[PDB]
Design a protein around this ligand. Structure first.
Ligand SMILES: [K+]
Ligand SMILES: [K+]
Ligand SMILES: [Mg+2]
Ligand SMILES: [Mg+2]
Ligand SMILES: [Mg+2]
Ligand SMILES: [Mg+2]
Ligand SMILES: [Mg+2]
Ligand SMILES: [Mg+2]
Ligand SMILES: [Mg+2]
Ligand SMILES: [Mg+2]
Ligand SMILES: [Mg+2]
Ligand SMILES: [Mg+2]
Ligand SMILES: [Mg+2]
Ligand SMILES: [Mg+2]
Ligand SMILES: [Mg+2]
Ligand SMILES: [Mg+2]
Ligand SMILES: [Mg+2]
Ligand SMILES: [Mg+2]
Ligand SMILES: [Mg+2]
Ligand SMILES: [Mg+2]
Ligand SMILES: [Mg+2]
Ligand SMILES: [Mg+2]
Ligand SMILES: [Mg+2]
Ligand SMILES: [Mg+2]
Ligand SMILES: [Mg+2]
Ligand SMILES: [Mg+2]
Ligand SMILES: [Mg+2]
Ligand SMILES: [Mg+2]
Ligand SMILES: [Mg+2]
Ligand SMILES: [Mg+2]
Ligand SMILES: [Mg+2]
Ligand SMILES: [Mg+2]
Ligand SMILES: [Mg+2]
Ligand SMILES: [Mg+2]
Lengths: 124, 394, 101, 46, 336, 240
RNA sequence: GCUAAACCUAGCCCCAAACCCACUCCACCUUACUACCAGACAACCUUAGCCAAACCAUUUACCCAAAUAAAGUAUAGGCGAUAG
RNA sequence: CUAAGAACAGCUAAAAGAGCACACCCGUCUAUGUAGCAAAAUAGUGGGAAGAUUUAUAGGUAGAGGCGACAAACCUACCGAGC
RNA sequence: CUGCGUCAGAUUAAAACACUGAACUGACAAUUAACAGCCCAAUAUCUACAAUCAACCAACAAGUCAUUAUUACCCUCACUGUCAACCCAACACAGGCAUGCUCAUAAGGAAAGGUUAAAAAAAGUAAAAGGAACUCGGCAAAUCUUACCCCGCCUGUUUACCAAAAACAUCACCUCUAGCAUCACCAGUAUUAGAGGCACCGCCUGCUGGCUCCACGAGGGUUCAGCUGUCUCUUACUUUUAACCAGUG
């Protein structure tokens, strides 16, 4: 007589079932002896809210604007806008070598970085 | 012989290695690259793994021999949970002391006159017993882990009301959660006592000596009784990872350095978890010896000789209904040999404060046979408790 | 944030920081009489009271003293023309008390 | 005596007997899920 | 079903709520001294106060490391028990009543009372009159019970020009939770105990309600609330239970005031409170025409010491120490 | 079935270890022995059946003092707690054993026999012929397995060429080496077989369930049928 | 004249042809759809029987890779039923 | 069957698979009912009710079988062999 | 798992009703943690002495609760359960349903839709004189009652849904098998274990068989006395049913 086609949630089951099931919220600590919960400050996501005083942009855009075509950003486009200008100046000067690619901005490895790209270790 | 642990409950033998590993110059093809198990590929051999950082929740201690405080010679530790097999007879040999039945005359003479007795003393003790076992909590019959400590704190509080007659009781306090350490040798046996739990009555003045000089010198003719084949270190925690260190429990500068009395409580609901009357007195003697030995070493250094001013430490051990009294005097700190000066210990055994307590009336055939209250109350037992508390202040 | 993978934390690790959050709360009028300082919000299930405490202080600069949350069950009794149960989504109700009176 | 009430609901028993973990424990129960996946069952287990 | 009233509570403005539950008006300061017709050594009391204080922090050697969450239950708790035990012995010459007094360590105090009415909103009992029942299960760290009753602070008919706060919503919004269990009226001992009158209570706030944590939770103005919310609930439950032991209840209201004292501390800061139970009739049937109300006096929290460094106490306060002595020196009036 | 034996402890101790009943069920979960189930809960007390087990720091003959002789639920006989040196262990008590008695455990075989005392453990090569023995072992280092039950006692019939003949309680002879350690005297609870159960309820207290109600015509002789030979097949039954 | 009665699509069937699908974020072998800790558990093994032989007991057809033909032929088989 | 729990007033009696007798368990007799309140119930009268008792929870034994104080009983309201 | 809270609805069948109609539809609202759940660094090492007011005493069925040494560690209150007139029986079903309190309530409820007062049927009450003459049978009812026989020692167990027994089990007795260990038997060892017969005990017997007997029984018969509408011989009244009116069907 049980409903097998309804979502199984923490509101169903005995006491042991109800307390063990959650709602999707991430854990921010661990349980120690004596059923005492220790909250870790670093596990709590801290919001980086910027100062919005004197900010020009607003939630909406005025209709009196041109209908510019959409140009998705690509890796080739970003390389030309950022890294290519520096290489051209160094290429003309004649001081260019693959050993110095780290100076242009290339990262041989992601280890030792606060924000690794793959696998990423930062939230949205 | 018969081994303990059936082979089914033990960890099963790991499966035999695949025969690809037995062929030299041949690299096996395993599922280590797939990061999951498959049956049609060889089982990889994983090298041992280290976490790489210290995690308190998942810490593993180094092997025992790698511990810094590791000694080949074992040290036998006596604590609150040790239950000696021979009781007092085993405790007397470890502490090198002579047993004397009955409390000293000087201690008992303090409460011999009616002038030092408490006003309405008999009624006050009955109300302390009645409150502890009947009126203490909401439940009709409180457990022993509840009235055993309370019945002792109230008696101390009852004896602490005599400051009006004796202004010398204002120089003492009751310390809880106090510990001490004491290390010595008994025939090439390194022994250590780590007392904890109970109440430690501290005083600003040391207790006066009980036995005279001639009585102490008469202990050389006494010989310690043996209990072969049972070893003196039986039922002791034989530990190879220890630290020989003397500790009075307090740092230098404590206003109440001299211990007066140790109160020991067997507050356990289960009878097997409670020390026997013979074993409880054994715990008292070792703790009284351990507390007195730390004072002797702190004041007279870490030598081994006959003390010029012997230290007297009292102890009262109770089960909540049965009381044991001990007066231990430390006469020497050279315990390696069995000859010479030996310590003295006055012990009173099996002192009943009350024979039985009825928390409910006994109604048989609609007749109240036994009313609520203590049965067989002995006021003489509390006099001994009062005499020990009044020692050093009268 | 919700529907994202939180980077794992170990002892000595960096502070977990979120720069863009997808949590959207909505202030609602309580259906029952409430204390004056009490404020009621509807928050996503993934949101905790610790996150909501920093959410209001960090974004709206609202000092908060106590946050209490509960999960509200959505009725599954409604059925359509096919006799198939229609589920009202469950939402979490948060009760926020102002700090300085 | 009176019959018809043989079913006494219990979530612990229901999940342990007909659960997803219980089905996949044995190769025979995996085919039970495979048949229901082939048939198109809305619920493959409890 | 009855509301579980917790004296040491994390609820905001719980003092204002508990005044309505107990019909108590809170007054600043202490009761006025009675203008009515030995040598007290302050130095001896000051030394013992520091010796007991320094014993737990510095002198006593811990076998294992004491953690932050264990400070209340390993350092603060033994200090409170030991300080009271020594003070009652040092004040016995100055107050004979303390000698024949019962001192308790962490004994439960229960009081069950009925105040208010509600109309059940839902269920088969909807629309029916059901009384609001309350239960206080308080376990003070220390308390002193005496055979005689202390003198009243103000007369029974005395009234103040202060209105008792009234809640506009249901008690569930405190938050307060209902639970059905055994109803107890307990002063700390059974009715057979001769020492059925209370003298002074000693409370230790839990580390969850510590001053430092409330500052992180923007509860700076709630620091004083926790002290007087515990006092109002604990003392009303204590005085109310004492009145019940004397045969008084809602219909047979008390004929004489019942008073008690309380000292609320977190280990460092101390607060002192005095309570008088003028009325025990709180049911809507009996409180409709009841003119009198219970009175509670309170002091601001003050630190006993500023900082403990090694074996020296910095900024020790004798005013806080003397206030503890005056509470203990209070004795019932003697007959002719 | 997810059956795990409770016999997982690997370190000897005198502490009573909690054991779980089987009900006649094997590891598969099906009944393998009938009539077993229920009864009062019992805690198993580990018994050291190797009487001569010198300590780690000691060797040779040693002595033990009996502390207490008590009741053991697991076995018919009583057990005794003995202390030798710095250890305590459970052994099977003899008929005449009290608290305070001293027992001797040795592996020495002298040229002549020695005065055998009840409860002492000596090798079979140093015991007089005919002395009652119990808790014998097949080979040295094997441990006592035979003559364990209450009141049981063996007989040292003869000793020849380093081997001895042991008469088991079932009146069967057994040949073992003379270096096997045995206990002198009978086992405790001699009048154990003289007990009266009294009621069917007491058998359910011991963990024994009632026998099956089926009338089994099968038996040792009734169930097994001798096949008549063709010559004798004619005379099997004659009408009367 | 009420209840009703009528309707033409939705889609489907059989062929031909050609070898099909499954990463938006999040969760999913633990009690699936559950962020986050020492495992070592691992897969493979003739189908049988109904039915026919008027019972049944040997036996009794089941695509194995080219339609047709050789040919229901050589063979097999309680030399029976039938198989081939 | 296993694990770890719970329950049994009062009275007579005695350290009782004792007696009376509630809760509780069972279902002796009679009557009602027979598409019924009920695919086995109701009312009264009865047996047991400190024990081989009753009972909640989780686990185990599965059909060539299980389990059974043998009634060819029971194994999810057709078990001489479940669906 | 939102299933008599609010509001609205062309609304309108919950086995009658219904405008506020509402246990229907739609929308809105809600149950806030202190209770409960979710626990614990490693390695060794410890844990003979029940419970029952635990003190007497008396047991067997032998039991439901304990650490230390060293190393590591001083960050803090998150998450989930919280409603109701509710669950299992196809139903708003006289059934089934664990524990704590209340032991007659301080809580929770309504047997009669209206009428009439035929038969028959059900339940209950009363009855002259007689008191089992009724009947397969003192079944039912009334009363509060004696003496046996048969069978089974007894408590207990069984055909859930026609058989509760004389059947099974049962101490006690008896037969048969087995000389031993690391998953049942068993962490046991012939005073043990298993497979069986019989059904205690006591007496008698062979070298296994027959009687006696204590209590006990919703077993099967018999009987004294009483009791009574069981009957001679039925009658009166009340309730349900009944019949009529209205709704549903
Ligand atoms: K046929
Ligand atoms: K019968
Ligand atoms: Mg279903
Ligand atoms: Mg919550
Ligand atoms: Mg069904
Ligand atoms: Mg059930
Ligand atoms: Mg048998
Ligand atoms: Mg039989
Ligand atoms: Mg055929
Ligand atoms: Mg046929
Ligand atoms: Mg009985
Ligand atoms: Mg009875
Ligand atoms: Mg049965
Ligand atoms: Mg039969
Ligand atoms: Mg038959
Ligand atoms: Mg069936
Ligand atoms: Mg909690
Ligand atoms: Mg009512
Ligand atoms: Mg009528
Ligand atoms: Mg009618
Ligand atoms: Mg008549
Ligand atoms: Mg007749
Ligand atoms: Mg009858
Ligand atoms: Mg019978
Ligand atoms: Mg009998
Ligand atoms: Mg019977
Ligand atoms: Mg039947
Ligand atoms: Mg039955
Ligand atoms: Mg029947
Ligand atoms: Mg029979
Ligand atoms: Mg007749
Ligand atoms: Mg007659
Ligand atoms: Mg008539
Ligand atoms: Mg009609």
């Amino acid at each position: 007589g049980a409903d097998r086609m309804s979502k199984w949630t923490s509101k169903r089951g005995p006491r042991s079932f109800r307390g063990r099931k959650g709602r999707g919220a991430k854990g921010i600590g661990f349980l120690t002896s004596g059923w005492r919960f220790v909250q870790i400050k670093e596990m709590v996501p801290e919001f980086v809210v910027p100062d919005l005083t004197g900010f020009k942009l607003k939630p909406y855009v005025s209709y009196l604007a041109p209908e510019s075509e959409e140009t998705p950003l690509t890796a080739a486009q970003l390389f030309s806008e950022a890294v290519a200008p520096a290489i051209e100046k160094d290429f003309k000067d004649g001081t260019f070598d693959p050993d110095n690619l780290e100076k242009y901005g290339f990262e041989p490895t992601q280890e030792g970085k606060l924000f690794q790209l793959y696998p990423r270790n930062f939230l949205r | 012989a018969y081994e303990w642990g059936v082979r089914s409950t033990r960890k099963s033998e790991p499966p035999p290695l695949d025969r690809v590993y037995e062929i030299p110059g041949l690299e096996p093809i395993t599922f280590a690259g797939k990061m999951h198990f498959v049956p049609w590929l060889a089982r990889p051999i994983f090298p041992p793994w280290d976490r790489g950082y210290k995690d308190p929740r998942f810490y593993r201690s180094p092997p025992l021999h790698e511990h810094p405080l590791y000694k080949d010679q074992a040290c036998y530790i006596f604590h609150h949970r040790c239950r000696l097999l021979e009781g007092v007879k085993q405790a007397l040999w470890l502490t090198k002391t002579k047993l004397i039945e009955g409390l000293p005359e000087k201690v008992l003479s303090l409460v011999d006159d009616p002038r030092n007795h408490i006003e309405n003393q008999d009624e006050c003790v009955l109300n302390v017993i009645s409150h502890a076992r009947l009126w203490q909590t909401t439940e009709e019959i409180p457990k022993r882990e509840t009235y055993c400590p309370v019945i002792v704190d109230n008696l101390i509080q009852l004896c602490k009301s005599q400051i009006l007659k004796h202004p010398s009781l204002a120089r003492r306090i009751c310390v809880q959660n106090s510990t001490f350490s004491a290390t010595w040798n008994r025939e090439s046996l390194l022994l250590q006592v780590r007392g904890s739990g109970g109440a430690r009555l501290s005083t600003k003045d040391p207790l006066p000596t009980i036995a005279s000089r001639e009585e102490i010198e008469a202990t050389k003719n006494h010989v310690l009784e043996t209990f072969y084949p049972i070893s003196p270190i039986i039922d002791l925690h034989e530990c190879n990872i220890y630290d020989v260190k003397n500790d009075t429990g307090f740092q230098e500068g404590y206003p109440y350095p001299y211990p007066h009395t140790l109160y020991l409580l067997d507050k356990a609901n289960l009878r097997p978890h409670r020390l026997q009357p013979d074993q409880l007195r054994a715990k008292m003697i070792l703790f009284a010896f351990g507390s007195a030995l730390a004072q002797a070493r702190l004041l007279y250094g870490n030598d081994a000789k006959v003390l010029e001013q012997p230290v007297v430490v009292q102890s009262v051990g109770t089960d909540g209904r049965v009381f044991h009294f001990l007066v231990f005097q430390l006469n020497t700190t050279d315990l390696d040999c069995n000859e010479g000066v030996k310590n003295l210990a006055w012990v009173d055994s099996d002192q009943l404060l009350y024979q039985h307590f009825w928390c409910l009336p006994v109604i048989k055939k609609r007749v109240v046979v036994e009313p609520v209250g203590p049965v067989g109350f002995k006021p003489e037992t509390f006099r001994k408790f009062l005499a020990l508390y009044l020692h050093g202040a009268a | 944030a919700r529907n994202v993978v939180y980077p794992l934390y170990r002892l000595g690790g960096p502070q977990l920081r979120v720069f863009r959050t997808n949590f959207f709360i909505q202030l609602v009028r309580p259906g029952v009489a409430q204390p004056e300082d009490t404020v009621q919000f509807r928050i996503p299930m993934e949101m905790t009271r610790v996150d909501l405490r920093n959410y209001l202080e960090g974004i709206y600069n609202v000092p908060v003293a106590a946050v209490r949350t509960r999960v509200q069950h959505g009725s599954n009794k409604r059925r359509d023309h096919r006799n198939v149960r229609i589920k009202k989504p469950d939402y979490k109700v948060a009760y926020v008390q102002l700090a300085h009176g | 005596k009176a019959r018809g009430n043989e079913y006494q609901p219990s979530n612990i028993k229901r999940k342990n007997k007909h659960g997803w973990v219980r089905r996949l424990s044995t190769p025979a129960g995996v085919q039970v899920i495979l048949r229901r996946m082939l048939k198109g069952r809305k619920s493959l287990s409890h | 079903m009855k509301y579980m009233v917790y004296p040491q509570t994390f609820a905001l403005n719980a003092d204002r709520w508990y005044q309505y539950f107990t019909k108590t008006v809170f007054l600043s300061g202490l009761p006025p001294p009675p203008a009515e017709p030995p040598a007290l050594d302050l130095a001896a009391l000051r030394a013992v106060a520091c010796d007991c204080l320094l014993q737990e922090h510095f002198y006593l050697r811990r076998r294992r490391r004491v953690h932050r969450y264990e400070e209340s239950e390993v350092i603060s708790l033994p200090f409170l028990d030991q300080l009271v035990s020594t003070l009652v012995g040092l004040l016995s010459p100055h107050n004979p009543a303390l000698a024949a007094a019962a001192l308790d360590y962490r004994c439960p105090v229960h009081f069950y009372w009925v105040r208010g009415e509600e109309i059940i909103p839902r269920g088969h009992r909807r629309g029916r009159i059901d009384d609001l029942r309350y239960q206080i299960d308080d376990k003070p760290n220390n308390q002193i019970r005496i055979s005689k009753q202390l003198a009243e602070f103000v007369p029974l008919d005395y009234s103040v020009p202060i209105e008792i706060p009234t809640i506009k919503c249901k008690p569930d919004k405190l938050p307060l939770f209902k639970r059905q269990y055994e109803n107890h009226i307990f002063v700390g001992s059974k009715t057979a105990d001769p020492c059925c009158y209370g003298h002074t209570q000693f409370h230790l706030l839990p580390d969850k309600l510590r001053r430092e944590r409330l500052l992180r939770q923007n509860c700076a103005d709630q620091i004083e609330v926790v002290f007087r919310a515990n006092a109002i609930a604990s003392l009303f439950a204590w005085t109310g239970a004492q009145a019940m032991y004397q045969g008084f209840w809602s219909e047979a209201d008390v004929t004489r005031p019942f008073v008690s004292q309380a000292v609320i501390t977190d280990g460092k800061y101390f607060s002192f409170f005095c309570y008088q139970l003028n009325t025990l009739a709180l049911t809507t049937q009996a409180d409709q025409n009841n003119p009198r109300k219970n009175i509670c006096w309170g002091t601001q929290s003050k630190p006993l010491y500023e900082t403990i460094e090694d074996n020296d106490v910095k900024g020790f306060n004798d005013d806080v120490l003397l206030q503890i002595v005056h509470f203990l020196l209070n004795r019932p009036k003697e007959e002719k | 079935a997810n059956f795990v034996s409770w016999k997982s402890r690997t370190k000897y101790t005198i502490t009573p270890v909690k054991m779980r009943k089987s009900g006649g069920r094997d590891h598969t979960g099906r009944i393998r022995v009938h009539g077993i189930g229920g009864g009062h809960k019992q805690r198993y007390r580990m018994i050291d059946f190797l009487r001569f087990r010198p300590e780690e720091t000691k060797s040779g003959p040693f002595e033990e003092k009996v502390i207490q002789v008590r009741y053991d639920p697991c076995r018919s006989a009583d057990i005794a707690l003995v202390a030798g040196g710095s250890r305590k262990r459970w052994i099977i008590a003899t008929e005449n054993m009290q608290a305070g008695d001293t027992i001797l455990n040795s592996n020495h075989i002298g040229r002549m026999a020695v005065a055998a005392r009840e409860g002492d453990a000596h090798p079979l090569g140093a015991l007089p012929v005919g002395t009652l023995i119990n808790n014998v072992e097949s080979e040295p280092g094997r441990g006592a397995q035979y003559i364990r039950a209450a009141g049981t006692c063996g007989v040292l019939l003869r000793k020849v060429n380093g081997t001895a003949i042991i008469q088991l309680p079932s009146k069967r002879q057994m040949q073992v080496l003379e270096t096997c350690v045995a206990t002198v005297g009978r086992v405790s609870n001699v009048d154990h077989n003289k007990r009266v159960i009294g009621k069917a309820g007491r058998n359910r207290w011991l963990g024994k369930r009632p026998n099956s109600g089926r009338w089994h015509r099968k038996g040792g002789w009734a169930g097994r049928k001798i096949r008549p030979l063709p010559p004798m097949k004619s005379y099997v039954k004659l009408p009367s």
